[PDB]
């Protein structure tokens, strides 16, 4: 069940000094890489983009080429409250907040799409902070109307 | 016992044809880029 | 299999250096055939039928003769999600944009309608661009107040 999730070549490691510390995710034939995450991008025709910045919302996108865009993830403007879909393992929203159990979630699991339990990305997670006895993530999402919006919890910790 | 212009001896009315017919000549020339420009974007309003 | 039988004979192939390089439709009364396509359609009496250029639509339309009103393909205005019969096969309309399996469709297949499960026209193509493991179609289609959106992606391969 939960294996039928990870199937999904479209994402791209980070590499730096041959370690691994994020991941580049291509979604609705755009290239999204975190900007806090130094290295490049294994795929060398994804890496020979040149990207444009966006500091505040903490991620830079590029155009992929034309025959790329066809195997990508497909984006969702709508994210209905419970059950979700992570490589790591079940992830839950509740007003407006995706939460995972404790320990998920490290230095190097940042630029993950969170799939949503259609087989579609909905959001991409750039860190989670653990306040009081809960787990939060700093996640960038899509509004119906498209403004890419962006919530994060107060204290976030990085990756 | 004095010193002329090129543009002394015009008078009003030719002034009036003149103008009328410059004026005229832009005139429908604006009417036309705004019609253009008018079914231009109703065009592009109508891509669904 | 099932996209196959879907086969109907108004459809016309346009003859000139004595090979096929597109086909010309009847549809809902008008025959609809693209700029690229050069030569006489093999039925005489639409060959000898004068038609009136559109160049920015991409198709030269044809006032078919009030006889043969009572046989031609039906226009559609709706367009579901989801897949469509062809002659090759089955045509995903996603995100508002027309793709194909890899591969299928090539020079001298452009002009061919794209219909529905019901067995109506509801679009025609006029060229195809690769997008990789999946070809997207340069399209045109009906709306409800019939005015004819062309969808054109990026630097098309002309059929």
Request: charged residues 20%.
């Amino acid at each position: 069940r939960m294996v039928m999730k990870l199937e999904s070549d479209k994402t791209f490691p980070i590499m730096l000094e041959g370690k691994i510390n994020g991941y580049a995710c291509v979604v609705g034939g755009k290239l999204f890489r975190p900007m806090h995450v130094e290295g490049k991008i294994d795929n060398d025709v994804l890496a020979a983009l040149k990207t444009k910045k966006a500091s505040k919302y903490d991620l830079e996108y590029a155009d992929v080429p034309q025959n790329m865009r066809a195997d990508t993830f497909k984006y969702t403007h709508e994210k209905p409250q419970g059950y979700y879909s992570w490589h790591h393992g079940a992830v839950q929203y509740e007003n407006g907040r995706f939460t995972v159990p404790k320990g998920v979630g490290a230095k190097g699991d940042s630029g993950r799409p969170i799939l949503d339990n259609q087989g579609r990305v909905v959001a991409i997670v750039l860190g989670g902070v653990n306040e009081g006895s809960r787990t939060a993530l700093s996640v960038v999402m899509w509004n119906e109307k498209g403004v890419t919006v962006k919530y994060t919890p107060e204290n976030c910790e990085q990756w | 016992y004095h010193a002329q212009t090129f543009t002394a001896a015009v008078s009003k009315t030719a002034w009036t044809w003149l103008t009328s017919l410059l004026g005229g000549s832009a005139v429908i020339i604006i009417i036309g880029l705004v019609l253009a420009t008018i079914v231009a974007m109703y065009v592009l309003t109508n891509q669904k």
